Design a binder for this molecule. Structure first.
Ligand code: HEM
Length: 137
């Protein structure tokens, strides 16, 4: 289920993190404009850029902690506030996070592994709701 999925992803996190984030950037090409130096690069070129590997790993390291601390796929309000107050996320909206979780769920459904994709769909929706209550537009 959800808790085991966290362990599965953490077991090979750098690979899953890059694959899922690329699936997100390729399903929603306009999201690349939020990052410097991503436009005009193929997947393999992005994976060889230092800031891509660093950001993607940090995103998933923290996302797995937020998921680990959640109850019934509902994140802690404190975790949502932390994500809102990051200066890095100034200018972002709940829509950016919504699209990331759509790509993540689609990736799980196509992987063929025993992911609990329905619980991750709920988690993404519940996280977006928490971000809104925390102050994100
Ligand atoms: C669960 C969701 C997310 C988590 C946990 C997360 C986490 C993080 C963390 C920890 C950093 C700073 C890393 C460091 O200081 O080394 C960061 C930076 C950043 N994040 Fe997020 N992030 C999430 C979603 C997103 C989304 C959806 C976007 C854009 C669509 C985004 C865009 C950025 C940008 C632009 C930066 C700083 C500039 C850069 O690294 O290129 N993040 N994020």
């Amino acid at each position: 289920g959800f808790k085991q999925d966290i362990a599965t992803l953490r077991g090979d996190l750098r690979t899953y993190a890059q694959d899922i984030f690329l699936a997100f950037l390729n399903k929603y090409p306009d999201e690349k404009r939020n990052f410097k130096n991503y436009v005009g690069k193929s997947d393999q070129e992005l994976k060889s850029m230092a800031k891509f590997g660093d950001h993607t790993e940090k995103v998933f390291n923290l996302m797995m902690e937020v998921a680990d601390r959640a109850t019934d796929c509902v994140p802690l309000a404190s975790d949502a506030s932390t994500l809102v107050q990051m200066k890095q996320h100034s200018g972002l909206t709940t829509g950016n996070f919504e699209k990331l979780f759509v790509a993540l769920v689609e990736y799980m459904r196509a992987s063929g592994q025993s992911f609990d994709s329905q619980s991750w769909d709920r988690f993404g929706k519940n996280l977006v709701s928490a971000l809104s209550s925390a102050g994100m537009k």
